[PDB]
Every structure is written in structure tokens, then in C-alpha cells.
Design an enzyme around this catalytic site. Structure first.
Site, PDB file in Angstrom:
ATOM      1  N   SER A 132      34.631  34.433  49.579  1.00 42.56           N
ATOM      2  CA  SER A 132      35.203  35.117  48.121  1.00 42.56           C
ATOM      3  C   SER A 132      34.128  35.884  47.362  1.00 42.56           C
ATOM      4  O   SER A 132      34.358  36.840  46.948  1.00 42.56           O
ATOM      5  CB  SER A 132      35.664  34.075  47.124  1.00 42.56           C
ATOM      6  OG  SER A 132      35.862  34.639  46.114  1.00 42.56           O
ATOM      7  N   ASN A 175      40.152  39.573  42.206  1.00 38.58           N
ATOM      8  CA  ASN A 175      39.051  39.100  41.339  1.00 38.58           C
ATOM      9  C   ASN A 175      38.300  40.282  40.819  1.00 38.58           C
ATOM     10  O   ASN A 175      37.946  40.181  39.420  1.00 38.58           O
ATOM     11  CB  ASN A 175      38.112  38.353  42.104  1.00 38.58           C
ATOM     12  CG  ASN A 175      38.806  36.873  42.469  1.00 38.58           C
ATOM     13  OD1 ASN A 175      38.172  36.032  43.132  1.00 38.58           O
ATOM     14  ND2 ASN A 175      39.855  36.602  41.880  1.00 38.58           N
TER      15      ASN A 175
END
Length: 676
Positions: free
Chosen positions: A406, A477
Site C-alpha cells: 500500500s 488513497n
């Protein structure tokens, strides 16, 4: 599409609806149907009519008229239902929306075992426009009709049979035979000749029906204050009950012709198509490639995120194997999985057989057979680089080397290997088995065939995939990182945090910036924000609010929060306190639009419509608003630009418009327009 009519030797006319994929009711089909009936009701050799669909499917809905209710009333109600020859619908596979409505117009219904029946119209922000607002409550009752229409959920033939929606359930091979036998039964008075539209048997007393309708309206304004179409649909229902059926129809015809003009239904319609187009990636999915069959998947993790993936995979009959370091961590991961399955048990033999698909291991020798690997280990580069070294070693040459990373650059993970073409990003959102979104992160090296493979796996596991590029925070994100920072900057400026949350939770979000920040966990929210602070410093704001709370360790306001924000006093206190709800939203979301444009311009996202689905499905952005980009153009680039500059020249480069937005905003052109 079309329709074909054939008259049997028993005098029954069978009409087949033919319009693949799901035999939707296009105008073409409908006008062929009209002609069919005008002929059947004139032919002496015809006694009754039967309607069925082609390829084991009745009709899936409307395709993708003079008056407002020419079809609903003149064709379906008058021509068909009020004919002096009985019609029987032969249902297989599905009967949704217009498909279900057409069947309700018929005088009886035969269906195959597990066929689906329902009115999904409301999900698109539209309403049933062929008489469904009338016939459904009269066939199944007001309480059930209201549930089906409001929830938009379909119902199986079996349950439909017990409700009075379906008259008989027979095997698919007896469907049409049963229907024509039923049709001649009606002609011969061996069976009732019922018109659904003028049936009151199932309705409640006038007074109580109003009590049920009032209630519904009330709680529909409590949950979905944002959308009007449901209430507009309830109107058509009430009118039909009170002023009678024929009044009800014309009321629905009117509501339907105006509901299409709503700005939230255009948003819902756009979200519908955009959902579909995420799998269309030019230069990757137009090459003629075909997904490979993945027969075994390995998940290196066992942790929270890893155990989540495994769950999603085995739930879709994927043989999954977890690898861990120690026996404890392994037995731990396997435990979380079982816990995830036992949770949704409260079938049995179901969530007992799917546990055989999951096989544990503390070794790599069981990777000699794996078709795809997903690494879900802590965000440690040194460690990840090593895992992919071993992967490349113990895995087959065709095996996909996917990572759930991530915060780490995919290109650095595969540093120690020569398998850059096999390394791809399979980014999930916790909980991995509930969150519908999947970010497929491609690199400059990721081979198209691997993307096509993963793109297909995503679909297999009931996920909605978007193919994004490799960069800080990919798409989702990175898109919403300004969201939380813009909020906190406002707070440090005096803005009441709880007002912020309330303004934005009402905007359509399922949560407020801070409210959601607490849910994610301060440790996580602050860990995922670090990524952007270091790669986009001149565009980020590191609020010391959270850290100061961490060092000190059914939710309600906290009278001990005021002292926390004050301590993080690095900035001053303007009149950002007392801002309007519109302003809170505008100062919190326009910077997100700004970032979405950077993402879109840089080519990180294939198309604007992908960003919409991403924000929607990843951050619960209001579907009826179309998506972060659809909404941006809904307001106007020139406005967003002009407003975003006023802030840049009054608060900092954080609000500064990016080149893409600025150049387009001045010309007043659309932002979602393809990059040129």
C-alpha cells in the site's frame, strides 16, 4: 431486438422475446409485440396467447413512445391485459423490471424453479413505468411490494409462488407446455380469468394502506434524504390505491417522465455504466488476449489483510495456501479466516467444505504448483524484496507475482528479481472480503496478459476492479489524502470538528472526516498519510493533532478535544470557524477534485469514470452525485478553479489548482473529458 410468434395446433399463440443478452424490452420488441397481439386477437385460429423469452430467459428489463404511458396503458393494460383472449407468461431465468411488469400484465404466470423476479428500477434512480407500481402490490401485497420496490432486491420463483406472484413452478422443460395448457384452461373456465390491475384481494383497507404508505415515506426521508425518486414512486402507489388503478397508471407515467430529469438519477445512471467500464483498459484489454485459468493461489501473510484475501478467494472456490514464519502466526491467520466464515453463518456444510480449500504451510516447496501469489506482509521494503526473491525461486515461471502493498513502490519490491513482467499490484481494502473495490496496480513492466488475468480474477470474486498506475497512493488513497488534511487544517483554524463531520455525513458520505479517522485507527490513518507527506510535501499538512492524542493514548462529543487541537497550535485562527456547510464541503472536497485531476492527467487513471467508481466504492462517495469527477463537472470547472485559487492566495499552495485543472477551468471546459 425482435419477437417471433407461432400458432400451435391447439390455437395457442406463443410469442418469444428475442433481444440478447437478457431479452430487454426495447421499443422494437414492444412494437413487434403490439403487432403480434393485434394479429392474434384478429385470427380465428387463435384462442389464447403465451409469452416467453429466448435462451431460457424471460426478460431482464429495459434496453440499454407518443404519450407518457402509451406502452404502460395503451399496449400493456388495454391491448394485452384487457383483451378478450387470455395471456400466460412462461418465465425462465429472470423477469426484472419491465420484464416482470409485462408478466404481471398477463393473466397467469408459470415459472422455472430458481428464476428471479423483481423491480430494480429504483437503483438507477428511476421507477417502474409499465404498471409495476400498480400490479405488484395487488399481486403480492402492499408490505412486500414496498419492500421489493424500495430495496430493489429480486425474489426467487419459489417465494414468488407462495406470495401469489407466480401461479405455478415447473421444470424449465415443461414451462411452455404448462403455460399453453394453462391458457386453454382459462378459455375453458377450468381456471380463473384474473386481471391483476383491478385486483383488490391483497390490498389493505383504504385507511391502513395510508398508514403503511405514510410510514414508508417517513423512513425513506430518514435514511435517504438525498434522493427524491423513491418518494415520487410511493406517490404513484398511493394514487393507484386511493383514486383507483387507472388513475394510478397515469400518475406513474407522469412520475416516470420527470424522474429521468433529476440530477441524482443522471448520477445514478452514470455510476451504473461507469461500474461496467472499469475493465476496459486501452492498450491492454483490446489486444485479443484471454484470461488464464488460475487453479491455485498462495497468500504470504496470515495477518489481518492476508487472512482477508484468503477468505475472498476460497469463498469463490479458489484453492488457497497461506505461508507464515512461525507456527503461532500461521495457526493465528488460519484462525482469523475461520472466524470470518463462522461470522456469516449466524450454510453449514458450505462453510465447512470451503475450509478444505485453505491449506496452511511454513514452507515454499508447496509453491511449485501455484498459479498466482499475493504478498500481504508488513510494509517493510527489505523484507518484501526478499519475499519476491524467494517467490521467483520456488514458483513456476508463469506464476503471477502480485503484492498487496500500500505504501511501497512496486518497482523496488521486485528489485532482486528479473520477473518485472510478472509483478503486479493487487490492492485490497480492509475488510478484504467485504470491500467491493480492487485496485490492480500496473507498472511500466507489468505485462498486459497478467493484468487481463488479474482483471478476470477480480470479477470472479465479486469485486469491482480498476486498473491504476504505480505511484504514491495509487488512485484511491492518493485521491482522498487531502480530504483529512483539509479538515484538520480547518480545525486548527478554529472550525468545530463535529460540525465538519455532520456537514459531510449529510453530504452523502457514510461518515465524517474525523469520525472516519477514528474508525480507521489513528495508527493506520497516520501511517498511510506519511507516504504523501514525504512525496508531496508542498501539498500536504502534517497536523500534530493525532500524534499528540496517541502519546496520551455509541460515540459522543469529547469535552477534552478542545485542549488537544490548541496544543497543536502552529497556525493562527481565521474566520474558518463559523463556515457554512456548503463551505466546509467545498474546502474539503475541491482539493480532492484537484488531486483527482492530477491523477487523471498524469495517466494514473485510465478514464475519469474510473475515478468516480473508485471514490464511490472505496470512500463511500455519494453514488447519486455520480462520483468525485462527475460531481466536479456538475458544479463547473470554472467555479472550482476560481474558488480553489482564492484559497491558494489566502491559505497556501495546498489549495493551489494543478496545471490540468487551471488550464481547463479558465476555458470552462469539462474536466472528465479525455486527456489530449
Amino acid at each position: 431486438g425482435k419477437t417471433v410468434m407461432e400458432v400451435g395446433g391447439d390455437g395457442v399463440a406463443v410469442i418469444t422475446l428475442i433481444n440478447p443478452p437478457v431479452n430487454s424490452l426495447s421499443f422494437d420488441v414492444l412494437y413487434n409485440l403490439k403487432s403480434n397481439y393485434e394479429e392474434a386477437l384478429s385470427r380465428n385460429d387463435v384462442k389464447a396467447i403465451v409469452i416467453t423469452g429466448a435462451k431460457g430467459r424471460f426478460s431482464g428489463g429495459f434496453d440499454i413512445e407518443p404519450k407518457a404511458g402509451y406502452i404502460s396503458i395503451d399496449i400493456i393494460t388495454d391491448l394485452l391485459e384487457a383483451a378478450r383472449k387470455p395471456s400466460v407468461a412462461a418465465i425462465d431465468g429472470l423477469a426484472l423490471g419491465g420484464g416482470l411488469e409485462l408478466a404481471m400484465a398477463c393473466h397467469a404466470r408459470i415459472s422455472a424453479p430458481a428464476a428471479q423476479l423483481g423491480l430494480p428500477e429504483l437503483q438507477l434512480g428511476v421507477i417502474p413505468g409499465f404498471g409495476g407500481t400498480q400490479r405488484l402490490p395487488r399481486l403480492v401485497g402492499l408490505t412486500k411490494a414496498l419492500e421489493m420496490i424500495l430495496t430493489s432486491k429480486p425474489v426467487k420463483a419459489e417465494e414468488g409462488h407462495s406470495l401469489g406472484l407466480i401461479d405455478a413452478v415447473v421444470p424449465p422443460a415443461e414451462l411452455v407446455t404448462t403455460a399453453r395448457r394453462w391458457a386453454l384452461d382459462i378459455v375453458g373456465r377450468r381456471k380463473p380469468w384474473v386481471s391483476s390491475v383491478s385486483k383488490t384481494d391483497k390490498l389493505p383497507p383504504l385507511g391502513e394502506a395510508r398508514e403503511i404508505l405514510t410510514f414508508a415515506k417517513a423512513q425513506t426521508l430518514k435514511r435517504a434524504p438525498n434522493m427524491k425518486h423513491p418518494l415520487m414512486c410511493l406517490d404513484a402507489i398511493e394514487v393507484g390505491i386511493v383514486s383507483g388503478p387507472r388513475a394510478g397508471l397515469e400518475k406513474e407515467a407522469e412520475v416516470a417522465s420527470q424522474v429521468v430529469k433529476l440530477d441524482t438519477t443522471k448520477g445514478l445512471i452514470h455510476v451504473f455504466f461507469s461500474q461496467r467500464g472499469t475493465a476496459k483498459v486501452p492498450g491492454v484489454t483490446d489486444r485479443g488476449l484471454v484470461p488464464r485459468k488460475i487453479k491455485k493461489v498462495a497468500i504470504i501473510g496470515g495477518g489481518l489483510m492476508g487472512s482477508g484475501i484468503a477468505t475472498a478467494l476460497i469463498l469463490s472456490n479458489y484453492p488457497v495456501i497461506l505461508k507464515e514464519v512461525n507456527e503461532k502466526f500461521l495457526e493465528a491467520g488460519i484462525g482469523r479466516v475461520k472466524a470470518n466464515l463462522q461470522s456469516r453463518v449466524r450454510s453449514q456444510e458450505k462453510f465447512e467444505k470451503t475450509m478444505s480449500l485453505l491449506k496452511g504451510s511454513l514452507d515454499y516447496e508447496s509453491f511449485r504448483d501455484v498459479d498466482m501469489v499475493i504478498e500481504a506482509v508488513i510494509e517493510n521494503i527489505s523484507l518484501k524484496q526478499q519475499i519476491f526473491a524467494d517467490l521467483e525461486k520456488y514458483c513456476p515461471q508463469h506464476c503471477i507475482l502480485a503484492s498487496n502493498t500500500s505504501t511501497i513502490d512496486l518497482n523496488k519490491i521486485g528489485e532482486r528479481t528479473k520477473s518485472q513482467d510478472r509483478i503486479v499490484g493487487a490492492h485490497f481494502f480492509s475488510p478484504a472480503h467485504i470491500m467491493p473495490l480492487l485496485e490492480i496496480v500496473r507498472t511500466n513492466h507489468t505485462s498486459a496478459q497478467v493484468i487481463v488475468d488479474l482483471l478476470d480474477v477480480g470479477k470472479k470474486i465479486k469485486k469491482t476492479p480498476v486498473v491504476v498506475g504505480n505511484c504514491t497512493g495509487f488512485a484511491v488513497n492518493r485521491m482522498f489524502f487531502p480530504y483529512t488534511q483539509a479538515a484538520m487544517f480547518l480545525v486548527e483554524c478554529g472550525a468545530d470538528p463535529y460540525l465538519i463531520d455532520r456537514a459531510i455525513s449529510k453530504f452523502g458520505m457514510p461518515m465524517g472526516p474525523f469520525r472516519l479517522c477514528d474508525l480507521v485507527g489513528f495508527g493506520v490513518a497516520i501511517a498511510t498519510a506519511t507516504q504523501f507527506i514525504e512525496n508531496f510535501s508542498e501539498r500536504t499538512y502534517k497536523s500534530m493533532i493525532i500524534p499528540l492524542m496517541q502519546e496520551d493514548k455509541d460515540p459522543e462529543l469529547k469535552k477534552y478535544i478542545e485542549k488537544a487541537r490548541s496544543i497543536s497550535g502552529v497556525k493562527l485562527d481565521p474566520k474558518l470557524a463559523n463556515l457554512s456547510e456548503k463551505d466546509i464541503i467545498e474546502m474539503t472536497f475541491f482539493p480532492v477534485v484537484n488531486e483527482a485531476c492530477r491523477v487523471f492527467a498524469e495517466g494514473i487513471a485510465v478514464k475519469a469514470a474510473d475515478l468516480d467508481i473508485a471514490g464511490i466504492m472505496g470512500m463511500g462517495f455519494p453514488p447519486y452525485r455520480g462520483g468525485i469527477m462527475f460531481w466536479a463537472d456538475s458544479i463547473g470547472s470554472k467555479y472550482i478553479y476560481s474558488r480553489l485559487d482564492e484559497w491558494s492566495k489566502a491559505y497556501g499552495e495546498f489549495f493551489k489548482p494543478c496545471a490540468f485543472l487551471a488550464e481547463r477551468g479558465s476555458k470552462g471546459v469539462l474536466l472528465s473529458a479525455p486527456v489530449k
